[PDB]
Design a protein around this ligand. Structure first.
Ligand SMILES: CCCCCCCCCCCCCC(=O)OC[C@H](COP(=O)(O)OCC[N+](C)(C)C)OC(=O)CCCCCCCCCCCCC
Ligand SMILES: CCCCCCCCCCCCCC(=O)OC[C@H](COP(=O)(O)OCC[N+](C)(C)C)OC(=O)CCCCCCCCCCCCC
Ligand SMILES: CCCCCCCCCCCCCC(=O)OC[C@H](COP(=O)(O)OCC[N+](C)(C)C)OC(=O)CCCCCCCCCCCCC
Ligand SMILES: CCCCCCCCCCCCCC(=O)OC[C@H](COP(=O)(O)OCC[N+](C)(C)C)OC(=O)CCCCCCCCCCCCC
Ligand SMILES: CCCCCCCCCCCCCC(=O)OC[C@H](COP(=O)(O)OCC[N+](C)(C)C)OC(=O)CCCCCCCCCCCCC
Ligand SMILES: CCCCCCCCCCCCCC(=O)OC[C@H](COP(=O)(O)OCC[N+](C)(C)C)OC(=O)CCCCCCCCCCCCC
Ligand SMILES: CCCCCCCCCCCCCC(=O)OC[C@H](COP(=O)(O)OCC[N+](C)(C)C)OC(=O)CCCCCCCCCCCCC
Ligand SMILES: CCCCCCCCCCCCCC(=O)OC[C@H](COP(=O)(O)OCC[N+](C)(C)C)OC(=O)CCCCCCCCCCCCC
Ligand SMILES: CCCCCCCCCCCCCC(=O)OC[C@H](COP(=O)(O)OCC[N+](C)(C)C)OC(=O)CCCCCCCCCCCCC
Ligand SMILES: CCCCCCCCCCCCCC(=O)OC[C@H](COP(=O)(O)OCC[N+](C)(C)C)OC(=O)CCCCCCCCCCCCC
Ligand SMILES: C[C@H](CCC(=O)NCCC[N+](C)(C)CCCS(=O)(=O)[O-])[C@H]1CC[C@H]2[C@@H]3[C@H](O)C[C@@H]4C[C@H](O)CC[C@]4(C)[C@H]3C[C@H](O)[C@]12C
Ligand SMILES: C[C@H](CCC(=O)NCCC[N+](C)(C)CCCS(=O)(=O)[O-])[C@H]1CC[C@H]2[C@@H]3[C@H](O)C[C@@H]4C[C@H](O)CC[C@]4(C)[C@H]3C[C@H](O)[C@]12C
Ligand SMILES: C[C@H](CCC(=O)NCCC[N+](C)(C)CCCS(=O)(=O)[O-])[C@H]1CC[C@H]2[C@@H]3[C@H](O)C[C@@H]4C[C@H](O)CC[C@]4(C)[C@H]3C[C@H](O)[C@]12C
Ligand SMILES: C[C@H](CCC(=O)NCCC[N+](C)(C)CCCS(=O)(=O)[O-])[C@H]1CC[C@H]2[C@@H]3[C@H](O)C[C@@H]4C[C@H](O)CC[C@]4(C)[C@H]3C[C@H](O)[C@]12C
Lengths: 240, 240, 240, 240
């Protein structure tokens, strides 16, 4: 169309994306400065104004991008993100609760969706997850079973660490990271339950063994593929 | 046979295994809910009844599976597991001791033996163990020798950490994870035994060096095999 | 030239570099001895004299090397280093501030730039950095966004850990290393902000997931290259 | 010879080595039992007698092995070990100091030198060290320089952690393991030296970066070799 293609050339323009990026880095520096009560005392009204300025400009940009991109926009996770991040930034400050005033900062993550060198890393990193889903499932089932057992064995005398299923989940994650697992948790438990080490040490083994096996399997299964491609390429040349 | 083959078609049926799985996930949600004293106050008799219901249904299922599978059942580790897990769930609640009431929760692990996507992970993970057996042996002998030495050097002034061979084992495992090894253990020791760092730092080196070498050897010995298969496949095509 | 080539033969001589190295190891032993107040009480004037002796000899050496090497000297990072390290050692002790008296010790790092077996390690190690620059950028942006969020959510009640953007950076690095992350930080926070675990646990996941992915990608992308070289070498022989 | 070859057939016999191993496992169980004051009260004279029994039998065995093996014995590290371990076990209990009574336990390590499945692991593990020697050198030089700097910056106000070069070495190793590095060390320092984080965080980076690079280089340099062998094997078949 003609009215359509006018917009589409702006949105798709390098000036557009850059101008957005410069806003982001500008609002980024602003949100770090808003951290200083000294600064907010002096210049606090400027950056509050600079904020919705950026908010609306981002709202407009989001709208245009939807007009240009159509349904392809709501099937693009980076666009979907930019949508919700700017959406969050839109519910009213006063009428809301404080937690939404803080989530405003997530708009700074647009610097990731904008800069393509950044998307690729996030994609690389996230790419390995879908193969781990069954492992994540198993690990969670594991935590679950042990959290139920812990809550029953230790919650009555140790409510802070194990009084509820949720609390026991948390402590077991703590033990998985090994943070103060022994001086902070098991040694105290053992003053009342001498055999507690029979619970947590195997827990520490399974959790540790599994995670390591995950990394070895990721590394070693990848090179098997590299060898598969290499093998066939070399086999082809032999074959002609 | 005819009486035999009637059963065998049910046990081997997809409806069967699914129905078991649905029970498991149902008893799983029940065992998490039984964690709440609020819930047990209100609905506590329902889930206690739902429990032996599931217990007997699992008992029956275990029996049928033995009739169908014969001696092949007691040579299958997944079946052997499901056996003992359901067995444990069968000794009486009142007459027993509390620890068996908790082991009941292990039946939730049937969701692993049932779901084949899960078995494969556990098999993958456990597969690497038999090659490590001599390394596990060496590490244990190592802990053993050092536990005897620690108990003798430090148990008299530090009975909580080193009074007995069992306690010294435990502290040495703690030091292996590095959890509070220095502020919590060696620094206190050194107020009385200034040279204690000569004991634990080499301990921290050997233990650490060995474990890392275990992971490198696992990764690197695997790709040697991948290269062996690849080499011969490629060598064959060259050979014809 | 003739005056030039006289010097150039000394600087480039094996005796030269060795003599410098022997000074370095000598000043190294001296700087460790200067650590003892007993020793400084007895022999403190000797090593203070031995110090500027070495300082000037290193100054002279640096000058000669610049005469010999010309502009190639200021394009060589090892020389540039040796320059600034000896430069630092030159500002006056009395008139300065204590921190420059300590930076004097960095001259001991010349033993690295001197010994070529050492340079190669540092080069190997530093070689992998330029590919990580965008990952370092992303991680820093990440810390930044979360530091702003933390300062806002937790600084008012927890000023030591989160009162300022700088402090929150520091605590988040602490949490990244996992050092006392739960007993020391999140558990205290949760007495006032029960949902704080929703902040730090995802933080602990992203940070951990990313770093691991960095190591796997480094290992696995390298062997892809090794396979590329190997593939073509083998493909060539097939091709003739 | 004839007197020689009589002995040589015993020493080299499978019965010999086994009999030694059975002693070792027997003295091993004895040294764990000697740990119990209950047991030493009851059966303490038996195991003290069983001890020099084993000591002399091991002395004799060591002698025979030297007669049989000649100078080849003192060029064999496993034999050299068994020598010194049994030697240590020989200096007198009463006249000595307690530390030699404890080193007696090292004889249990003969179970490693005896069992060949064990030697191979220790050899594998130790095999990777000689390539790391220059890296170990660099890391130690690094600790050294930073230990001198720490002692000067922080020893006067923090003598326990940094009063001497030896103490600062120890704390820096603690920081390398990250054990309580921040709550236990840097945070206290920063109450007096706000910029202390500029010292330890880069320290934590270098130390961490180097060690990781060591593991990646070990893994990745090994597969380069595997590819080299594979490449030439495959290239040969192409060549005929
Ligand atoms: C630094 C820590 C992480 C920061 C993340 C910032 C916010 C991320 C926005 C949400 C993105 C999630 C969806 C996403 O990226 O998915 C990518 C993959 C492959 O998509 P593709 O476009 O093929 O790359 O599907
Ligand atoms: C090897 C790779 C995988 C490694 C991880 C395996 C999965 C296990 C992760 C567990 C994480 C810890 C969860 C946690 O913090 O538990 C707390 C929550 C909420 O209970 P709540 O009582 O509100 O929290 C404690 C509140 N308190 C202390 C102030 C009274 O307790 C709950 O009710 C939450 C339980 C569900 C958590 C689901 C996590 C799924 C995995 C996350 C996705 C991973 C993708 C990479
Ligand atoms: C065998 C496989 C089965 C899979 C089942 C997965 C789903 C499990 C659902 C059951 C959740 C049970 C939660 C529960 O009992 O909550 C306990 C507490 C509340 O305790 P309560 O005493 O009710 O608090 C009273 C509070 N008052 C006085 C103010 C009224 O609240 C909490 O502690 C927080 C709730 C924690 C939920 C953790 C969810 C873990 C998901 C695991 C997923 C496994 C995937 C394979
Ligand atoms: C690099 C890979 C391998 C890494 C691990 C190497 C093997 C060493 C693991 C040692 C684990 C720690 C053992 C432990 O907790 O020791 C405590 C037990 C029981 O003594 P007890 O006095 O009852 O416990 C202390 C009681 N207290 C403090 C309340 C007075 O002390 C004992 O008497 C138990 C001693 C035998 C433990 C056997 C462990 C064998 C390895 C486990 C299988 C690994 C398969 C992956
Ligand atoms: C050179 C290779 C030799 C291999 C030998 C392996 C087997 C070792 C068996 C010897 C175990 C000795 C155990 C021992 O002495 O127990 C000490 C304490 C009990 O102290 P005690 O003073 O008797 O307690 C009195 C209690 N009272 C007052 C109520 C009567 O009880 C404890 O502290 C718990 C017992 C700890 C046992 C740890 C087992 C480690 C196995 C290492 C396997 C190495 C494989 C290569
Ligand atoms: C996976 C690989 C990458 C892993 C690391 C990712 C990057 C994040 C590293 C963050 C390091 C922690 C920074 C830190 O210590 O923050 C403190 C500083 C100074 O603020 P200040 O308020 O002076 O410090 C606290 C003072 N106090 C507590 C006594 C009141 O706060 C600041 O203002 C400093 C903020 C900028 C730090 C820039 C770091 C860039 C990365 C370093 C280069 C890496 C090359 C390998
Ligand atoms: C979306 C991407 C945007 C990228 C922007 C990167 C640059 C950010 C610049 C903004 C820095 C804001 C610093 C700031 O607000 O400082 C707060 C505090 C000072 O608080 P204040 O209350 O002013 O202290 C008063 C002291 N008195 C009473 C003696 C006068 O001072 C501190 O806490 C120390 C300053 C911390 C600086 C941390 C720098 C992080 C760099 C991140 C780089 C990201 C790269 C992609
Ligand atoms: C479990 C932690 C370590 C335990 C070590 C026990 C005591 C070791 C005895 C001393 C052995 C040191 C010498 C040694 O084994 O060197 C082997 C290599 C290659 O020799 P080769 O005989 O080729 O194997 O040259
Ligand atoms: C990435 C791979 C390599 C990783 C390690 C790199 C090398 C650095 C390791 C440093 C280990 C820590 C040394 C240590 O504990 O320092 C203490 C000693 C003795 O000083 P002292 O004042 O007696 O000890 C403190 C006594 N106090 C607290 C009770 C008053 O201080 C000293 O004077 C000892 C200084 C020399 C230690 C030499 C260590 C060389 C490396 C070990 C061999 C590695 C082979 C795998
Ligand atoms: C640039 C490369 C140069 C390489 C040089 C390597 C060798 C260094 C030798 C210098 C060692 C200096 C040791 C030193 O000053 O000791 C300080 C303290 C003793 O303090 P002090 O105040 O004398 O104690 C008086 C005690 N009283 C009252 C009872 C008489 O004693 C201690 O704190 C313990 C001694 C610590 C020694 C640490 C050795 C590290 C070796 C690093 C190897 C690097 C290899 C590349
Ligand atoms: C074997 C383990 C766990 C499952 C199990 O142990 N069985 C799973 C969990 C994560 C999985 C990898 C990632 O998905 C990334 C990548 C995707 C490619 O598409 C195929 C190759 C690769 C390397 C996957 C291989 C394998 O599938 C892994 C290691
Ligand atoms: C070399 C080390 C330790 C023994 C030693 O250091 N000597 C041992 C301990 C664990 C062992 C691996 C696992 O078993 C998994 C797998 C089984 C295959 O069947 C053969 C390949 C592979 C990768 C094994 C190779 C090697 O055997 C390992 C690394
Ligand atoms: C893939 C990741 C992160 C970027 C991303 O995830 N995308 C980046 C970060 C560090 C990068 C490596 C190092 O630079 C060292 C080396 C340089 C060679 O020149 C090319 C090969 C190699 C192994 C690089 C491959 C790859 O580039 C890495 C793993
Ligand atoms: C590159 C790094 C550090 C030196 C540096 O960074 N330069 C050094 C330190 C340890 C060294 C390895 C071990 O020695 C084991 C083994 C011995 C073989 O003989 C050759 C192969 C291999 C894998 C060695 C390769 C390389 O030499 C390593 C990784």
């Amino acid at each position: 169309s003609h009215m359509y293609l006018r917009i589409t050339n702006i949105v798709e323009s390098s000036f557009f994306t850059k101008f957005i990026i410069y806003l982001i880095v500008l609002n980024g520096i602003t949100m770090g400065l808003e951290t200083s009560k000294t600064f907010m005392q002096s210049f606090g009204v400027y950056t509050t104004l600079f904020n919705q300025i950026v908010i609306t400009i981002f709202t407009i940009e989001i709208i245009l991008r939807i007009y240009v991109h159509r349904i392809s926009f709501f099937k693009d996770p980076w666009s979907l993100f930019d949508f919700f991040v700017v959406a969050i930034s839109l519910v009213p400050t006063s009428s809301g609760f404080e937690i939404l005033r803080v989530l405003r900062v997530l708009r700074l993550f647009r610097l990731v969706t904008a800069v393509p060198q950044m998307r690729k890393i996030v994609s690389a990193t996230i790419s390995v997850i879908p193969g781990m889903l069954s492992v994540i499932a198993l690990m969670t089932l594991f935590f679950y079973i042990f959290a139920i057992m812990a809550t029953q064995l230790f919650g009555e005398r140790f409510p802070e660490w194990f009084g509820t299923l949720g609390e026991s989940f948390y402590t077991l994650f703590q033990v998985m990271t090994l943070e103060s697992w022994s001086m902070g948790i098991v040694r105290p438990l053992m003053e009342v339950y001498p055999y507690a080490w029979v619970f947590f040490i195997p827990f520490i083994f399974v959790v540790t063994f599994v995670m390591i096996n995950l990394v070895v399997a990721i590394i070693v299964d990848a090179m098997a593929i590299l060898n598969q491609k290499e093998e066939q390429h070399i086999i082809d040349e032999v074959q002609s």
